[PDB]
């Protein structure tokens, strides 16, 4: 057998033929040698352009549902029972309903009886095709359309939630009293429906409400006041938790004002994160491979730092270096580095059995205290300048002293260097200089050769001492996958289970090879590196 992903994908391509739409052939055969992430994107495309027309058969829907679920478990997951309330509605001595505020992706809440949907995109992608077919049937069978304030209940299918509440709010162009009342009816309709649904097996019952072009401050207070009174007036309610789920920071603020501070917490992690944590705690050695995504998580951010290496319309060399010196300075003094400040002390517990190899050397490893003897930078770094004609191997120089000596002489409004004697020129051919990073055929890799030698010696020793090596790959994109990503996959493949890979990043390039995940050798954590790292390493 091929994998479940390969099997399922070929039947959906096949379905797109025999009775498909027209929105070709080759992918079906070469599939087995295509990249996992690419194939999941194709599978999701096949489903998005599915004519709902002939029902997919049961066994195929089961496979689709398994895949969506397995992929969604790579996200950082939040169980309902981990949240902390901002308000408690006390039901005499009968019990209580907790009211929470939570910013995030509603499909990544776990242990949640019901979630809400307006009228679409994320919930349908994640629930799978069964949701479209149940909404279609239930809408036909009721015959009428949804009025503002009404709700349609479906199963959650491939979602972690048991049920979905699909509701229509009012629409405006200035909110009238009828529209205020329509929005409140939505919340009431949701809670009344939810009262009648079964509980989870532990007796809890929970709903995540999304924000339902209505003024956000007023919508938010109708939501909180409506839910609050309804719970006050239903002391016998079987409802135990209501989550106001915001996405934007402004909504979270509107809601936080109305609701108040979060209560005091009174581990049990989940998803690929728990597995990654196991691996990290059993490791005898750790390699960190990092790309630009790690520093982007700290606030330093399609482009290949176009400003420095691409942009080529400088009014003069004084402007060019004024900008370059200001940039090197700002990076060198970056004050917000909490992810580095958590990762580095954790790596130090490994002594000589930890190593850092980075393709986007902005210098933040060294500046948060990682030693250069356990560091590699094969695409170069901001630590050096070089001759732009690359006239000889020695035509490089440390950048830091030149940055420092130049900064007092740069007009901050125009970023113009006001002393031309500070323009760096090749001390041998006198040509222009650049930052010594791979950004063109002129790159000189000679100042990083010692780093390369340290990496070869370290790998060699760690692999031969048969150690349980974990590769934590942080924020590596897809521009040059041969530098870190493919060699990491390779070590995993060659090393007979002694090497495992945890890839962490945002977006779908965070995925690892399906077959290595199946063997328990590789997993990934898709989300913000700044969020994942404290969770992996606590
Ligand atoms: K479900
Ligand atoms: Zn030169």
Residue numbers in the entry: 8 to 30, 37 to 132, 148 to 201, 205 to 243, 249 to 302, 308 to 342, 361 to 597
Task: Copy the relevant paper text.
In some pathogenic microbes, the response to oxidative stress is controlled by a SirTM/zinc-containing macrodomain (Zn-Macro) pair responsible for establishment and removal of the modification, respectively. Strikingly, however, the “catalytic loop” found in all other MacroD-type enzymes (also termed “loop 1”) is replaced with and extended loop containing the zinc-coordinating Cx(4)HxC motif, here termed the Zn-loop. To gain a closer understanding of the functional role of the 3α-bundle and coordinated Zn2+ ion, we solved structures from the three sub-branches of Zn-Macros namely from S. aureus (SauMacro), Methanobrevibacter oralis (MorMacro), and macrodomain-fused SirTM protein (Mfs1) from Fusarium oxysporum f.sp. cubense race 1 (Foc1Mfs1) in their apo form as well as of S. pyogenes (SpyMacro) and MorMacro bound to ADP-ribose (ADPr). In all structures, the Zn2+ ion is tetrahedrally coordinated with three metal-coordination residues within the Zn-loop, while the fourth coordination-contact is exchangeable and is provided by either ADPr, a water molecule, or a symmetry-related protomer within the crystal.
In the Foc1Mfs1 structure, the Zn2+ ion is absent from the macrodomain, while the structural Zn2+ ion coordinated within the small subdomain of the SirTM domain is still present. This absence leads to increased flexibility and distortion of the Zn-loop within the crystal structure as indicated by the loss of density information for the region (residues Asn133 to Ile147). The Zn-loop appears to be partially stabilized by contacts with the 3α-bundle. In particular, the contacts made by Asn46 seem to contribute to the overall stability of the Zn-loop and the exchange of this residue to cysteine (Cys61 in Foc1Mfs1) within the Mfs1 branch may contribute for the absence of the Zn2+ ion from the Foc1Mfs1 macrodomain structure. We therefore created macrodomain only construct (Foc1MOD; aa 1–305) and compared its zinc-binding ability to SauMacro. In line with our structural observation, the amount of zinc copurified with the WT Foc1MOD protein was reduced by approx. 75% relative to SauMacro. Surprisingly, neither MorMacro, which arises from a minimal operon containing only the Zn-Macro/SirTM pair, nor Zn-Macros derived from Msf1 fusion proteins could demodify SpyGcvH-L. In contrast, all Zn-Macros could demodify Glu-/Asp-ADP-ribosylated PARP1 E988Q. Identifying the physiological substrates for example, for the Mfs1 fusion protein would not only elucidate their substrate specificity in terms of attachment residue and sequential context but also reveal how these proteins contribute to the oxidative stress response of pathogenic fungi.
